[PDB]
């Protein structure tokens, strides 16, 4: 089970940016489901329409995501699971939304 660490501003990144630019584009998942590892089985992003679209404009912090949070992304259309560690950073600069460590 592979693991990655991503640096971003938890108060500026939307659920949609996480889904489309980070998990799908950067990490090449085709149809990801993303879970917050809070031990409660919170599903933040679903690959089923239209289950989590209503949250697409919301900032990650609105769901308790903070420095040190762990997300689990699981591709529905590949055997491919990825643990994402969140580093909250307010100093990435104007041209950067997130950085993979």
């Amino acid at each position: 089970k592979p693991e990655v660490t991503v640096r971003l501003n938890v108060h500026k990144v939307t659920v949609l940016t996480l889904q489309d630019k980070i998990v799908k584009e950067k990490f090449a998942m085709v149809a990801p489901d993303v879970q917050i590892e809070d031990g409660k089985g919170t599903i933040l992003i679903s690959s089923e329409e239209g289950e989590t679209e209503a949250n697409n404009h919301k900032k990650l912090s609105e769901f308790g995501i903070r420095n040190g949070s762990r997300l689990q992304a699981d591709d529905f259309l590949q055997d491919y699971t990825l643990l994402i560690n969140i580093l909250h950073s307010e100093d990435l600069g104007k041209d950067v939304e997130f950085e993979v460590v």
Binding site: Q35, G39, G41, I43, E51, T52
Partner: protein, 157 residues
């Protein structure tokens, strides 16, 4: 907790890849619009050729942190007329009891099929409500009419 959630992810994926026609099972929405893997809203179609035919019967399935060592709790919402359904809606079924026929290998699909099966075979040794049990035991033609009436009511349209 992690053991439970890993299993529940597998269950969700297998359900999405192949479920029986007319059935519904999806994690319920938390108030903030996230979904909750430990709390599903489900639906069960009445079996064809039986007085439940045409009805669609909704229920909730709650998983505890020691799932799959323990079974989920299942509850019809709203409560049904049926000898093995409590007034609260809770379903009385032996594969749903940890000290009886529950085994961890039992899938969500198997639970929902087992509940659908229960609908048309009441278990007279384990009644959960006074009314449907009494009528089933004493007046089987009246029982069938109440079920038909109830199936008509929960017809989706």
């Amino acid at each position: 907790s992690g053991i439970a959630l890993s299993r529940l992810a597998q269950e969700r994926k297998a359900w999405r890849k192949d479920h029986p026609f007319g059935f519904v099972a999806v994690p319920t929405k938390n108030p903030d619009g996230t979904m909750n893997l430990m709390n599903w809203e489900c639906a069960i179609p009445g079996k064809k050729g039986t007085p439940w035919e045409g009805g669609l019967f909704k229920l909730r399935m709650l998983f505890k942190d020691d799932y799959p060592s323990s079974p989920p709790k299942c509850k019809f919402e709203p409560p049904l007329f049926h000898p093995n359904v409590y007034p609260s809606g809770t379903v009385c079924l032996s594969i749903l009891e940890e000290d009886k026929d529950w085994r961890p290998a039992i899938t969500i699909k198997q639970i929902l099929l087992g509940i659908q099966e229960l609908l048309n075979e009441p278990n007279i040794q384990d009644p959960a409500q006074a009314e449907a049990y009494t009528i089933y035991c004493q007046n089987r033609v009246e029982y069938e009419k109440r079920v038909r009436a109830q199936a008509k009511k929960f017809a989706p349209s």
